[PDB]
């Protein structure tokens, strides 16, 4: 499933598409996980080691 | 009433003209948030 | 009403005006009824904590040891349950009532003395005054810091907490009686209503307006959102040390240190 | 004009002066300068 | 005729991009089926702005407010002032006048009135240390956000002035195709008519989660008192992790309510940038469809920026149709030759626009 | 068309306002343009 | 004559005087300040009609291509 | 009297630099935060001591001349900055000094050395101290 078809297939709806190769931009804020899902991920600093000099 | 108003008008375009113009013969020959920190006190 | 003075204390009803039972105490600092009015319990200079029950007569049990330094304050929840001791030893211990026995459950450590201790009506915050002049404010439940209240010259002698709980108002030696909001840690407005030190301040029960003592004798009447002085009321010769309101608002306390108490009833 | 600036340094409050021994003093020759129990108490 | 969109999603972008093409559009079912059908004061006040910086615009609201026919005109700007109303804060009006301000005849001087913070909108630093450097990037030399007074809510009472001399043709095409190393991290923790001890403790709670690191690590302390701290007692974090080898910034914000914690906040929003790391490969998500208007609009030649699969989502998605339907350009994404991440590339062809209505 | 001469000024509460501030500044100060006895 | 009832005014409201006398809030005293001013102005003892022209100014003071068109009800 | 006494301590018998560029220069280098707290040494005229009453929360002026210090008052007397400000009397290194964050001031030539090592001395001594010294030294 190439994403690059399925974002220019208007038939298919977004959430349709994310889930098959796997709201609204006013929000300029993106969407996160709760907080203590997000404080658990990262006890540690791992994972992003490469990103940070 | 209009008379003032323009005498207004055409102080304020000489005035913008000059300054201007001390710019253009200034040039032929840091910091942009610097003002927040006074601002911050009152 | 009760009154603790050093070695007595004693339970006067307002129409008698008379006291119906005495009782043996210490140089107790703060008083307190427990729920019903069925026990009084006080707090000791020596840092003693006094339990009497006004029906048997007698104490019921003293934990000498419960605190080692001056008891300045006590405070009880709404249902009774937890007590709170804010004391001279810069710790906060928290009692709970077993079946009636007193029992320690924790101490907070705190790096200055709790001069007062005031639990809110809803007991969602507890507040602590500290010689600081630093006011912190834990919730009650989880015993967390919350917010902070700075700026007064001299350490909080008084807090109070309104009905709806948003509002705090801090009395201190600096004079200056200052209104700050809970949901921020803002203050609204500071008053400078006594010259000398406001020693207790209180909010009449179901009513923004506040009540202020001080050592100049004087007892006003001040209302929140105005800010300014609704009533100025003068009967005591020497400083008044302590004001308490009733549950229905209609009447206040006041005690001197004339050895004169007082009742000024609403009308 | 000494004396009328002898007399500015006693106007103000925010003074303070050192002799030759160290010591913190005001002005007028005084040495300048809460307690839980007073405070409450 | 006029080419169609339904409901208020994107209201902002639809047009804007309608005025950068110049193609008028229609905007139809904005809430039909809600009890209070059609545009918000907001969304009105939004075009109002868009009257004010350009000229010979025209724009149709229906009898009812739920359809909307835009026909945009040239940017001219010129100095003004907006009155935000308090349903949204001044980022609300603010970011989308960075799409049209490089491409105007005359510079912008816009002077913002309201509340200045939220949390479902872009905050004041968002927009001065998250956004205009990515301007900078794209060829924007000059742009500024000034802090005239802080608002924070309900009250409000904020002031910002957004200035922006450079007046470009069009940015510059972007070539951007590595993961750029973060040097530091940086970031403002503000706080409005409080004791300056809640802006300390924000910044604790930062610390806390990010002393892990290996970098630098400088937080300011923003305290606002006084006449210039608004109406309303507030405060909040932003915390930007900056890349100097190519200029490039990741940035999370927040603010705080009653009854929050100062080091909470502090520990979410430090909890809440590195996420947008993880997630992102060149520019983060918040970033991302300021980057991807702009190479739309660069000229006629293929720019390339390196995207991170988290980033490709509902959001990516709808931008890029909307772009389609008013500038018919398609984003191509191709995979990276390396193994250890699975980025993508974006490839975009330029229009060739170019800034018509400046003085030459 | 443009007007020969200075335009005859009016004394709105605004200038009134101004005035007075002056008037109260010098005499917070005793700061007074008055003749004295040689 | 004026100076007199100003004195007496200002008296009134304790604007003058000695403050630390032995044997009225601040909020109180700015609000005496702007009556006392607006009330011993008599040009803007009350002046005759017409000598002030400020709701001429006024008005005069209160006194682009395209637009929106609202036709929402 | 309290004059008597004053004269005694002090009889009440310094070049200063003009170009305020380098003191622009010597305030950023501090670059002092408003929390940060400031020692002020030598302040003569006061035009260095109000800068640092600008960019610092409190300002403490330790003069050698009595007059000196005297019309630095005066420049200050009834100003927002007045209750910021403190001066005292007597040279530094005679009496313990109130603990500062940064050091700013006109440090004298003859005890600018001994001034130095005062601070490395001093517990808790300033992060960052900018001063003007002979070139040569």
Redesign the interface.
Request: overall charge positive; proline content about 0%.
């Given at each position: 499933w190439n994403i690059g078809k399925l974002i220019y297939m208007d038939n298919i709806s977004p959430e349709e598409c994310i889930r098959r190769w796997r709201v609204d931009l006013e929000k300029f804020v993106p969407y996160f996980d709760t907080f203590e899902k997000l404080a658990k991920k990262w006890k540690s600093v791992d994972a992003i080691k490469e990103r940070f000099l | 009433?209009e008379?003032?108003q323009?005498?207004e008008e055409?102080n304020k375009e000489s005035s913008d003209y000059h300054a201007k113009m001390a710019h253009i013969v200034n040039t032929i020959n840091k910091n942009?948030?610097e003002?927040?920190r006074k601002?911050?006190?009152? | 009403l009760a009154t603790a003075s050093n070695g007595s204390l004693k339970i006067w009803n307002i129409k008698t005006h008379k006291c119906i039972r005495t009782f043996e105490c210490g140089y107790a600092l703060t008083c307190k009824f427990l729920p019903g009015g069925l026990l009084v319990i006080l707090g000791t200079r020596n840092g003693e904590l006094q339990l009497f029950d006004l029906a048997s007569s007698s104490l019921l049990d003293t934990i000498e040891d419960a605190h080692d330094a001056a008891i300045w304050s006590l405070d009880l929840t709404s249902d009774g349950k937890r007590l709170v001791t804010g004391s001279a030893d810069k710790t906060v211990k928290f009692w709970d009532f077993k079946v009636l026995k007193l029992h320690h459950d924790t101490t907070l450590e705190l790096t200055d003395d709790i001069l007062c201790v005031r639990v809110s009506p809803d007991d969602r915050y507890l507040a602590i005054s500290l010689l600081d002049n630093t006011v912190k404010v834990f919730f009650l439940d989880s015993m967390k810091f919350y917010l902070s209240l700075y700026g007064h010259k001299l350490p909080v002698l008084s807090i109070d907490i309104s009905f709806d709980s948003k509002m705090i108002i801090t009395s201190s030696a600096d004079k200056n009686i200052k209104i700050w909001g809970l949901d921020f840690g803002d203050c609204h407005k500071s008053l400078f209503a006594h010259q000398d030190s406001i020693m207790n301040v209180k909010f009449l029960p179901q009513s923004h307006n506040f009540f202020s003592c001080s050592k100049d004798a004087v007892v006003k009447y001040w209302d929140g959102e105005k800010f300014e002085c609704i009533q100025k009321l003068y009967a005591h010769q020497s400083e008044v040390w302590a004001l308490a309101v009733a549950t229905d608002g209609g009447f206040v306390v006041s005690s001197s240190h004339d050895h004169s108490i007082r009742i000024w009833e609403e009308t | 004009k000494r004396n009328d600036v002898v007399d500015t340094l006693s106007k103000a409050k925010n003074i303070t002066v050192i002799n030759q021994k160290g010591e913190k003093k005001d002005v007028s020759g005084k040495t300048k300068k809460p307690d839980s129990t007073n405070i409450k108490l | 005729k006029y080419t169609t969109f339904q409901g208020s999603q994107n209201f902002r972008l639809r047009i804007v991009l309608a005025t950068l093409s110049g193609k008028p559009i229609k905007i139809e079912k904005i809430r039909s089926g809600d009890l209070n059908p059609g545009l918000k004061d907001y969304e009105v006040s939004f075009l109002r702005l868009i009257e004010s910086v350009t000229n010979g615009s025209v724009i149709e609201i229906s009898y009812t407010g739920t359809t909307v026919i835009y026909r945009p005109g040239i940017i001219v700007g010129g100095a003004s002032t907006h009155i935000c109303p308090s349903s949204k804060p001044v980022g609300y009006f603010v970011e989308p006048m960075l799409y049209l301000a490089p491409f105007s005849k005359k510079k912008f001087s816009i002077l913002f009135k309201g509340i200045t913070a939220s949390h479902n909108d872009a905050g004041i630093e968002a927009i001065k240390w998250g956004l205009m450097p990515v301007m900078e990037k794209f060829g924007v030399r000059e742009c500024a956000l000034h802090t005239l007074k802080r608002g924070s809510p309900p009250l409000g009472g904020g002031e910002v002035h957004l200035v922006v001399d450079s007046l470009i043709a069009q940015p510059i095409t972007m070539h951007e195709i590595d993961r750029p190393i973060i040097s530091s991290i940086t970031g403002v923790a503000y706080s409005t008519r409080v004791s300056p001890s809640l802006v300390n403790r924000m910044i604790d709670g930062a610390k806390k989660v990010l002393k892990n690191l290996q970098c630098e690590v400088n937080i300011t302390a923003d305290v606002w008192r006084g006449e210039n701290s608004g109406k309303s007692p507030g405060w909040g974090i932003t915390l930007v992790a900056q890349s100097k080898q190519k200029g490039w910034s990741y940035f999370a914000e927040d603010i705080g309510d009653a009854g929050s914690i100062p080091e909470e906040l502090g520990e979410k929003v430090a909890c809440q940038l590195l996420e947008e790391i993880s997630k992102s490969a060149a520019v983060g998500r918040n970033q991302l469809p300021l980057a991807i208007v702009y190479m739309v609009i660069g000229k006629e030649d293929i720019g390339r920026l390196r995207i991170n699969k988290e980033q490709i989502d509902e959001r990516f998605i709808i931008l890029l149709r909307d772009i389609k339907k008013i500038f018919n350009t398609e984003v191509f994404l191709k995979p990276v030759d390396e193994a250890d991440n699975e980025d993508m590339i974006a490839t975009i062809k330029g229009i060739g626009f170019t800034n018509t209505s400046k003085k030459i | 068309f443009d007007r020969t001469a200075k335009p005859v000024p009016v004394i709105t509460s605004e200038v009134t306002e101004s005035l007075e501030d002056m008037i109260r500044r010098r005499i917070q100060d005793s700061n007074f343009d008055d003749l004295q006895r040689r | 004559s004026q100076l007199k009832n100003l004195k007496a005014a200002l008296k009134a409201r304790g604007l003058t005087g000695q403050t630390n006398v032995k044997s009225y809030d601040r909020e109180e005293k700015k609000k005496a300040i702007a009556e006392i001013r607006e009330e011993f102005n008599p040009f803007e003892a009350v002046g005759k009609p017409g000598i002030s022209k400020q709701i001429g100014e006024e008005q005069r003071k209160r006194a682009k291509r395209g637009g929106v068109i609202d036709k929402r009800f | 009297s309290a004059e008597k006494h004053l004269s005694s301590v002090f009889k009440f018998n310094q070049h200063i630099l003009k170009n305020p560029l380098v003191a622009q220069g010597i305030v950023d280098k501090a670059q002092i935060r408003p929390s940060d707290v400031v020692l002020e040494v030598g302040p003569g005229t006061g035009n260095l001591t109000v800068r640092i009453l600008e960019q610092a929360k409190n300002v403490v002026a330790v003069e050698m001349d009595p007059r000196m210090a005297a019309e630095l008052t005066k420049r200050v007397r009834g100003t927002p900055v007045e209750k910021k400000l403190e001066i005292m009397l007597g040279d530094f290194m005679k009496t313990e000094l109130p603990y500062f964050d940064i050091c700013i001031s006109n440090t004298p030539y003859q005890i600018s050395s001994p001034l130095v090592f005062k601070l490395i001395n001093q517990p808790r001594p300033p992060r960052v101290s900018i001063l003007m010294f002979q070139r040569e030294f």
């Open positions: - | 009433f008379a003032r323009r005498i055409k942009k948030y003002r927040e601002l911050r006190g009152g | - | - | - | - | - | -």
